[PDB]
Amino acid sequence: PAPEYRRVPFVKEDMEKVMEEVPEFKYY
Amino acid sequence: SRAVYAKLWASTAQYTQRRHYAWYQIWSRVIPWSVPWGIFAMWMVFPAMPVEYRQALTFGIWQKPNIGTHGPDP
Ligand SMILES: CCCCCCCCCCCCCCCCCC(=O)OC[C@H](COP(=O)([O-])OCC(O)COP(=O)([O-])OC[C@@H](COC(=O)CCCCCCCCCCCCCCCCC)OC(=O)CCCCCCCCCCCCCCCCC)OC(=O)CCCCCCCCCCCCCCCCC
């Protein structure tokens, strides 16, 4: 009795909009 | 993701500005050494200046030595 896997389809997204979701990070 | 990789690349874009901030930090620790070296310099050249100027930098405190010689002529 294997588990039921939900599907996650590939989607094409605008790069500039996905950058609004990246966590803040500072090196300097 | 390409978005993540872009933010990591850009993290070090302002190298030149951060070096300038380093300049400020170090020069703020070093610049006070100018006061000791400045006091000694004036201390050394004080006796080579005219009498009139020596009485000005001290607000009339300094005066000629009184050792008992070279007094007024009757
Ligand atoms: C718990 C322990 C306790 C223990 C017991 C207590 C211990 C303490 C007891 C101590 C007692 C005293 C002891 C004796 C000491 C004195 C005697 C002495 O030592 O004399 C020396 C002795 C003889 O002395 P002398 O030459 O006859 O003295 C003549 C005088 O100097 C005559 O000098 P002059 O007349 O030519 O010039 C004087 C003039 C000199 O004047 C000047 O030069 C400058 C004057 C103008 C200053 C303008 C300042 C403008 C800015 C003001 C800012 C104000 C701010 C106010 C803020 C207010 C805030 C509310 O000063 C004045 O006119 C008076 C000053 C009045 C004005 C007030 C302002 C003063 C300056 C302040 C500066 C800033 C301070 C604060 C800084 C930090 C904060 C910013 O010499 C010897 O014994 C020589 C022996 C041979 C030595 C050989 C050495 C080695 C040789 C070989 C070398 C090669 C090998 C290398 C070896 C290296 C070895 C290291």
TrEMBL record, chain A:
Signal peptide: none annotated. Transmembrane segments: none annotated. Coiled coil: none annotated. Substrate recognition and binding subunit of the essential mitochondrial processing protease (MPP), which cleaves the mitochondrial sequence off newly imported precursors proteins. Belongs to the peptidase M16 family. This is Putative peptidase M16, alpha subunit. It comes from Toxoplasma gondii (strain ATCC 50853 / GT1).
From TrEMBL, chain B:
The keyword Transmembrane helix applies. Keywords: Membrane, Transmembrane, Transmembrane helix. The keyword Transmembrane helix applies. The chain crosses the membrane at residues 26-46. This is Transmembrane protein. It comes from Toxoplasma gondii (strain ATCC 50853 / GT1). The lineage of its organism: Eukaryota, Sar, Alveolata, Apicomplexa, Conoidasida.
